[PDB]
Amino acid sequence: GITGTWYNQLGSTFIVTAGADGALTGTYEAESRYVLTGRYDSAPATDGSGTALGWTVAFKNNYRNAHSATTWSGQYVGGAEARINTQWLLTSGTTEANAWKSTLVGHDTFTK
Amino acid sequence: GITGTWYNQLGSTFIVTAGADGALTGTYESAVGNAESRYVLTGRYDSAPATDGSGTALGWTVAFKNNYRNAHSATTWSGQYVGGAEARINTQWLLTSGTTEANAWKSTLVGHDTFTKV
Amino acid sequence: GITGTWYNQLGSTFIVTAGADGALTGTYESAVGNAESRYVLTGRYDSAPATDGSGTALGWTVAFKNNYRNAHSATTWSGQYVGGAEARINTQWLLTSGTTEANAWKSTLVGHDTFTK
Amino acid sequence: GITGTWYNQLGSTFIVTAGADGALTGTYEAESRYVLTGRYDSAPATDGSGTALGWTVAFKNNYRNAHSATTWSGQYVGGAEARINTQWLLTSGTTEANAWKSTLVGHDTFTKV
Asked: Which family does it belong to (chain C)?
């Protein structure tokens, strides 16, 4: 149930395809569209546990470059209403003097 | 630059190819935890970084499933590449395990990794 | 405002008083009632927040050790108070457990809690 | 052992006094001095385990206000070269429109040297 169009809390849209080998590929939202790549556990447990996954987006496309990248780590939860629960790290490229403030942390919840 | 073999402070091995689309591909082998042999990684990087001395932002994911064993978990590394006589990849990571809704609050570990050439 | 009784998404109880000097003191309730699961908290907040609608920055710590149990672990919450009337406290936390040097890479959990008054 | 003057890799002086009832009090460094308050495990294991700790500093004093606070979470590793390893979270006050980018994360290592 991972393959699909997902939306987070701020109307961002993630279109993902989950290959049977464990690959995740797709798009993050024209000038605002970006490539995404990740991996997921293609053989989760069955004690009712979520499926672990993750992905990465570099905020560079042919229209802009913000010099940074975000990784989302979390799990897909199946049920009457499917969701993906994640936490994320965004890192910006900095000078070494500035490295201490290069990384933001947050959380996102996605729904179809 | 980024392409090559790196080692973190625990001895884990990171073998990467940085392509010109900004794709990261390679394998990861962990010196710790419930992992054995190599795992597939996939990632992205800024392939047109600032020319100002700023590091190179990157990120990647490893799901710890291979033919040897499955830890039902995935890790992401977010950080930057700093070139030079002692080139480095400084990262922070999130490790999420599959849990039941009830146990979710203890699903995610956080830490930092430093990768160097030896 | 910040002073009062709050609870997070899992029903845990936080009893906090904000001091005139930016001090935060109070108690963490794991169960509603049980005293064996009652823990001392302490923190700091911004006693003079910006006037443009920004929240109020805050932080606090709970070490999981009282008269009855010692988990050998400690949690810190970082986040902000947002008043108005819905009034919410939004945080991120870090829980560390004492470990050997060899297992330090698995000593800290991370998450987010939201509080209701 | 915990009580003392600690320095991080970036300079900053933290002065902490450890209390027998698990409390932590001190200052982060006069217009750049701030109150720090925290807790720790005053009965740690002797199996080689580190002592769990946490503290908070809100960056307002009688001179300045940055509208931000930081929490540190980690453990004291005593022994030959006493050290405190930590992960930290800094939050600033934001509108809740800028809320997704209100919180920075990093790690700090402290020595008495």
From this structure: Belongs to the avidin/streptavidin family.
